[PDB]
Design an enzyme around this catalytic site. Structure first.
Site, PDB file in Angstrom:
ATOM      1  N   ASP A  47       0.821  -1.213   0.000  1.00  0.00           N
ATOM      2  CA  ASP A  47       0.000   0.000   0.000  1.00  0.00           C
ATOM      3  C   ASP A  47       0.857   1.267   0.000  1.00  0.00           C
ATOM      4  OD1 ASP A  47      -2.383  -1.729   0.179  1.00  0.00           O
ATOM      5  OD2 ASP A  47      -2.237  -1.727   2.377  1.00  0.00           O
ATOM      6  N   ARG A  54     -10.329  23.139  19.650  1.00  0.00           N
ATOM      7  CA  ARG A  54      -8.952  23.313  20.112  1.00  0.00           C
ATOM      8  C   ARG A  54      -8.299  21.958  20.399  1.00  0.00           C
ATOM      9  NH1 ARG A  54      -6.243  27.620  24.274  1.00  0.00           N
ATOM     10  NH2 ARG A  54      -4.207  26.570  24.465  1.00  0.00           N
ATOM     11  N   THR A  86      -9.190   2.236   7.239  1.00  0.00           N
ATOM     12  CA  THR A  86      -8.369   1.219   7.898  1.00  0.00           C
ATOM     13  C   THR A  86      -7.015   1.753   8.347  1.00  0.00           C
ATOM     14  OG1 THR A  86      -7.712   0.454   5.695  1.00  0.00           O
ATOM     15  CG2 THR A  86      -9.461  -0.694   6.783  1.00  0.00           C
ATOM     16  N   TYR A  92      -4.833   5.740   9.501  1.00  0.00           N
ATOM     17  CA  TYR A  92      -4.786   6.672  10.618  1.00  0.00           C
ATOM     18  C   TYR A  92      -6.192   6.974  11.170  1.00  0.00           C
ATOM     19  CZ  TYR A  92      -2.592  10.654  13.135  1.00  0.00           C
ATOM     20  OH  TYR A  92      -2.136  11.487  14.158  1.00  0.00           O
TER      21      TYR A  92
END
EC number: 2.7.1.23
Lengths: 253, 254, 252, 218
Positions: free
Chosen positions: A45, A140, A153, A155
């Site tokens: 990937d 924030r 799938t 981060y």
């Protein structure tokens, strides 16, 4: 059909690049890296990432294929021992192609990327989330991540975002250590948006760290960042049924 | 033409009960084959109204007044008599079909939840005929797109715009420990994907469908999928989901 | 003076009398009335109702836990042989649950304590040392001892605490957290002498659970958690690496 | 508070810049800087508040703190927390409690919070909130990749006095470590060592943590 191959760069992948190349020379298939109608990546990937981005402006008629040398990942559909089968099934033109959605970042003249996985924003970080021109929260914290189904799938997943089937036409925003108090009241949940909803994040510094997929360019004096489902999709040459939930089983369970 | 009105039954929905019936007096009422079902009382009322006319869902356009599904304030209840008075185009939300084997079929508009009695809750999840995980914990929730703002949210799911045709499973208090390892992450399935919950030790669960939470002996498969039916909403203004997400969860400055 | 409790199965009954066969020598005697060492055979559930037999003789009894294939029991079956010989002291905290109506019951707990509805919404108010803190509409609340953080507290999202640490840990269960019923979401660790109190608002609900026993109570006026003055004592021969047994139970 | 500065030290013993009292301005943010005596604060979780103050100007009350240790060895104290993250690529670290391995953590990074520091960053990473008086310390995870390879504990972890978590590298050798607000990178770190310092902080008192928490978040 014309074609080109990229390599991870280790000796075994280059070794299968050249073999596949000589494999194809016997059929009605010509080699082209400037105008390929078929693109191959060898090495998973992360390398598939570069191929995608190496031909963004001809994404419209390319048919991508991926081979991964170890385990499977989510973009490679193929083992290198199986190249020999691939070379003849591709020659025969016996493949169905599949569309996955993309995610268009807009910066504000303006800049405008594509994303097969995701896109993030950092750099004291305080931004006004505006959905379809109507304010939604003032955030924030560390940052926000907008991610594609194919990107869920990745981060996304590590941020508490939900795992989506790639065929669904959507984007999904997740927070990064939102403080979430009285002043800076955020949803907490991830937000799964459809085609034609635009999320615009607007400042309250204006110099953020904006990473599209892996490429992080620091931008200066930004007046708006704007995310949405992209009209452009990405197409995989497919020969066998894909089983998304299987590979989610395989990678994680 | 025809119409009816469900009422929470409290002493606020009940002034407005006939105040809208008498209002319609100059523009008549059915409780069996209405072209409109109007809800007065809140979201749980709307559901009970949905589960009362789920049979006739094809020719109904629902509408609701609140004292996530009601888009109408009681002070506007007569500008709503005026807006229905002439005649809007409907917008539709997917529903979640639920099959129980032993075969008992149910749609939900929010969620379906499986837990067990006493004795631990362990159930094999099976997606598209294929094993995916063996889950242990308090239970599992499959939600519809409209339903994500409900129970599913408090579970840890994503909020989804209801136009998206999908369903969403989320975990209840799963044990993860080298015996039982679950995905943990919530899961959004498209149409034509089938998630089936198959029993392991104990085979008698508590299965809820929206607000109707029933007990089942004998069970050997529970099978979620998204339905071919839909629920239609009648709208003259019209709706911003995230606007309503923002009102229930962030601020309501007015 | 000694005692043993058993699971009920063949294997547990197996070694109970074997250890009393090794104990019939030595200067030690059995009385399941006044023992100062109490021995579980069979794991951590079986350990839990043993403790719940000797609450009023707590601050005076040692507990060792014997084990099949755990967080309370620190010996396996094979190792019973030498145990007899050198049995021939550590504390972990507890949490008192008080209910009010119209008189008050009370229950020590070694893992946790959970509130629920009896049918409808669980809508409660969280008053901390007599000062309102939030209003909760969800499924219920869990308050855990440290020694219970690896239990249901772990699943609900709670922090894992080492057990020497003298605290309690309220966690939520499926709070709506909207602008009406706003909650902290986070786990909260209350220390000694902090009183956390659960007043209802509409319906007088509440299926309560202590460790594993779920007793209904109707019209409860009020519920109160606070760190225990009593404490449970463990007879220990080695050093304890709780963090290693956390590795084992949960990481492969 | 430049305006509130000598405003009422004109109203008042003495003043010199080895103090016996250090008062904090305008809130928790640069009380962290003043951090590095009984301390007191007035804010424009640590500053519990100006005329009636020097008028009353006391009990001194205990909050614990965190030692960091990087390896000559340098060490860093902490009122809030300490975190390790990688400079460029994959943050991969081994967790060694009490001199015994526990897990190999991969992702963004890791966060060791003090008890008083739990209302801060720790809260936003999912830590628990502790009344600071509790003799403890807490590690919370930043964005782990938890699969087949890098299986991690998930839960936040609470350690007491004397317990030591030691964080050790696996591939690359530098990380951006930092404590409270500062941000000091380090190349060539072989071990990172979080333990409650024997230290204590004293507050000049004349709180309801659970009500200040209430007021900030509810």
């Amino acid at each position: 059909m014309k074609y080109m191959i990229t390599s991870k760069g280790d000796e075994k992948s280059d070794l299968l690049r050249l073999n596949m190349i000589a494999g194809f020379g016997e059929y009605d298939m010509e080699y082209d890296d400037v105008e390929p109608e078929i693109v191959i990546s060898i090495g998973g990937d992360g390398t598939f990432l570069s191929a995608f981005h190496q031909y963004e402006e001809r994404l419209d008629e390319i048919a991508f294929i991926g081979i991964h040398t170890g385990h499977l990942g989510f973009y490679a559909d193929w083992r290198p021992a199986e190249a020999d089968k691939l070379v003849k099934l591709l020659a025969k033109g016996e493949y169905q192609k599949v569309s996955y959605p993309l995610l268009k970042t807009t910066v504000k003249k303006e800049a405008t990327y594509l994303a097969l996985n995701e896109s993030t924003v950092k750099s004291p970080f305080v931004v006004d989330v505006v959905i379809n021109d109507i304010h939604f929260e003032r955030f924030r914290g560390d940052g926000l991540c907008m991610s594609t189904p194919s990107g869920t799938t990745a981060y996304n997943k590590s941020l508490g975002g939900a795992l989506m089937h790639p065929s669904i036409e959507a984007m999904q925003l997740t927070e990064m250590a939102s403080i979430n108090n009285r002043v800076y009241r955020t949803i907490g949940s991830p937000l799964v948006f459809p085609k034609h909803h635009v999320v615009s994040l607007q400042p309250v510094d204006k110099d953020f760290q904006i990473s599209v997929d892996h490429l992080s360019i620091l931008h200066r004096d930004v007046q708006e960042i704007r995310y949405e489902v992209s009209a452009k999709k990405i197409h995989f040459a497919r020969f066998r049924s894909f089983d998304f939930w299987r590979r989610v089983h395989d990678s994680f369970i």
